Design a protein around this ligand. Structure first.
Ligand SMILES: Cc1cn([C@H]2C[C@H](O)[C@@H](CO)O2)c(=O)[nH]c1=O
Ligand SMILES: [Mn+2]
Length: 346
């Protein structure tokens, strides 16, 4: 038991917050960055003052999560990819304490070259030996879900642009603190990655080890959108209007929970107008543990509060290295090796 059972609430903790303006001009405090990402931290950084288009893109794409999740089964079955371990396209998963959640995954190779559906395959790295990273994206039909693909790409591009600036700040820290560190490494790794993976998640309405570490470098996050799908039906019926976002969460216990090295778990909120970034294990390895991936988990809304009508939508963008990039620069372990569980090499 990490969080109190029943109606009792965990304390809420404030994440370190910086302005995108300071990320862009290179004046973000490295003290604040270490407070956000260091060994005693929550492993999360909130970025405010985001581009003006963010609010609408978030609203549209999180609405698409509901529309997508309610497409006829014949359409969703075409988006399933078992060879990719369901890490490309659509699939159904479950969360127990008892919520059903549909996931849609896409690689973000398009960030580097908009014509790419996935990394260019090689003998060393291809869909047959790394299907969970290198399989081609599977998109819903434009006629049945109009505008989904450009909206998805535009919001992911915005979030990755910000991730590149966060990575640049991390590089400033590492260049000051780590002897022999390659200047500009994390910025280059994020900016050129064709393995970065985005996940659009839809919690279906329901009637009345817990933590993980992210594996990549920096995970961009939106705040969650709750939708009353009885009031605004998630049915594609001119442009496609967004669905109604509930102003306030129906369940104050839903959300993100982080267990710092203090051993106790706190709830952490993302302001609706902000983007947050969590550190992952690859960034921890690249910084030799000077920044840490911090254990955490997400809870959906309890069925009593969903009341068979309220769905929950989120976007996460797992920026991470190309498979051949080193993550342990002493032992020369690559991200692909690291992903296959290799922890030592000689
Ligand atoms: C699918 C995926 C998940 N993650 C995060 C969320 C998962 O719960 C965790 C372990 O895979 O890492 C990544 O960092 N990269 C990915 O490609
Ligand atoms: Mn996570």
């Amino acid at each position: 038991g990490l969080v109190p059972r029943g109606s009792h609430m965990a304390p809420i903790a404030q994440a370190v917050t910086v302005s995108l303006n300071d990320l862009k001009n290179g004046t973000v405090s490295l003290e604040a960055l270490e407070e956000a990402f260091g060994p005693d931290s929550l492993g999360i950084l909130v970025v405010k003052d985001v581009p003006a288009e963010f609010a609408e893109l978030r609203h549209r794409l999180l609405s698409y999560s509901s529309y997508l999740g309610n497409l006829p089964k014949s359409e969703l079955d075409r988006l399933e990819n078992e060879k990719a371990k369901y890490l490309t396209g659509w699939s159904l998963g479950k969360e127990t304490l008892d919520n059903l959640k549909g996931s849609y995954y896409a690689n973000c190779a398009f960030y580097v070259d908009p014509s790419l559906s996935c990394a260019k395959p090689t003998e060393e790295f291809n869909p047959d030996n790394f299907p969970e990273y290198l399989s081609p994206n599977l998109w819903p039909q434009e006629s049945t879900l109009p505008g989904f693909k450009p909206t998805f790409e535009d919001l992911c591009r915005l979030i990755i642009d910000v991730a590149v600036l966060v990575a640049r700040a991390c590089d400033r820290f590492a260049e000051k603190q780590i002897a022999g560190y390659p200047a500009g490494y994390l910025e280059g790794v994020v900016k050129t990655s064709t393995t970065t993976k985005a996940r659009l998640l839809h919690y279906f309405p329901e009637e009345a080890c817990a933590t993980h570490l992210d594996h990549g470098c920096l995970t961009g996050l939106t705040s969650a959108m709750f939708v009353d799908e009885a009031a605004t039906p998630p049915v594609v019926n001119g442009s496609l209007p967004p669905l109604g976002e509930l102003p306030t969460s129906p369940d104050p216990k839903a959300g993100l929970y982080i267990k710092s090295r203090t051993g106790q778990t706190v709830q952490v909120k993302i302001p609706r107008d902000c983007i947050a970034f969590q550190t992952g294990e690859a960034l921890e390895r690249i910084t030799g543990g000077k920044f840490k991936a911090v254990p955490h988990f997400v809870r959906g809304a309890r069925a009593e509060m969903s009341a068979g009508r309220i769905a929950r939508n989120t976007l996460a963008v797992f920026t991470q290295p190309n498979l051949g990039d080193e993550v342990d620069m002493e032992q020369h372990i690559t991200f692909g090796e690291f992903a296959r569980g290799i922890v030592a090499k000689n």
